[PDB]
């Protein structure tokens, strides 16, 4: 399986530099998880960027990939709560943010690797999905 | 019943001006919900400011108040998403931000009044808790 961070799905839908690779990664893995909160964040950013029609693309995307939205349970939040002490952002530490916490949280509990774009998850303890 | 927001609990723990009244409202209704994501945001803010021991006080409060951490389901995220387009904190206007969405969604789906601190949730299609 895999978990999708918003950084990737926003990057894909906005057609950012590495888009097609993320699309291959997605295709390689049959089951694909996304935290209900990561879903939200994504919808917020796109529907601000491209308005509602952008939002309609997200829904098709989600239906096309057959993504499983997972609810944010307490244990996910607990995992994230601890992770932010170690890995969270600060003055010049370039680690996790509040949105990232829910992707981290879901990956840690599920035991599955995460698909993302940027530094935020580079130096963490969860597995990453390797791009082809 | 009530829904508790991050802005309230952080107020009640940092000993902000209104704290005492916020406690009274909590006592006035026995059944209390809080979204797992608002719990996280509270944990992050508290444990940043007062370290891990602040988190221990956060955990005692939740236990003592018998607060039910409700998981964020897709339905809550959908109403949050739509709401934000109307009541979002865009340029120049106060209103909901990413974090607020999680208590709004729980409040909107549960259909229960929300206890909060500040301007974000004021002009909005969900009920506020009356402050004694």
């Amino acid at each position: 399986m895999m978990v999708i961070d918003t950084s990737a799905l926003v990057a894909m839908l906005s057609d950012e530099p590495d888009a097609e690779r993320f699309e291959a990664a997605v295709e390689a893995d049959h089951i694909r998880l996304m935290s209900t909160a990561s879903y939200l964040e994504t919808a917020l950013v796109i529907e601000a960027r491209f308005g509602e029609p952008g939002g309609r693309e997200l829904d098709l995307w989600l239906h096309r990939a057959a993504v499983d939205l997972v609810a944010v349970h307490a244990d996910q939040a607990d995992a994230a709560r601890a992770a932010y002490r170690t890995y969270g952002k600060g003055r010049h530490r370039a680690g996790l943010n509040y949105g990232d916490c829910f992707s981290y949280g879901l990956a840690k509990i599920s035991g599955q690797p995460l698909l993302f774009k940027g530094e935020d998850f580079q130096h963490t303890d969860i597995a990453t999905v390797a791009l082809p | 019943m009530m829904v508790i927001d991050t802005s309230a609990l952080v107020a009640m723990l940092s000993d902000e001006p209104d704290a005492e009244r916020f406690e009274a409202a909590v006592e006035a209704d026995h059944i209390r919900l809080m979204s797992t994501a608002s719990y996280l945001e509270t944990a992050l803010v508290i444990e940043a400011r007062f370290g891990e021991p602040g988190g221990r006080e956060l955990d005692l409060w939740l236990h003592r108040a018998a607060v039910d951490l409700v998981a964020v389901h897709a339905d809550q995220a959908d109403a949050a998403r739509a709401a934000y387009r109307t009541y979002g904190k865009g340029r120049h206007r106060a209103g909901l931000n990413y974090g607020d969405c999680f208590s709004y969604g729980l409040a909107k789906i549960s259909g229960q009044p929300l206890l909060f601190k500040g301007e974000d949730f004021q002009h909005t299609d969900i009920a506020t808790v009356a402050l004694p």
Binding site: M12, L13, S14, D15, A19, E20, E23, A24, V26, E27, E41, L44, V45, I46, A48, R49, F50, G51, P53, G54, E57, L58, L60, W61, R64, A65, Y98, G99 | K89, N97, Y98, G99
Partner: peptide, 30 residues
Amino acid sequence: VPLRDELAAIRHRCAALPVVDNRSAEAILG
């Protein structure tokens, strides 16, 4: 019939919409 094609159609269609808001974060505030 392949999935990457279906997701690329959505990508291409979505990326070419008019940008009504240009700033990134602070749409996501905190």
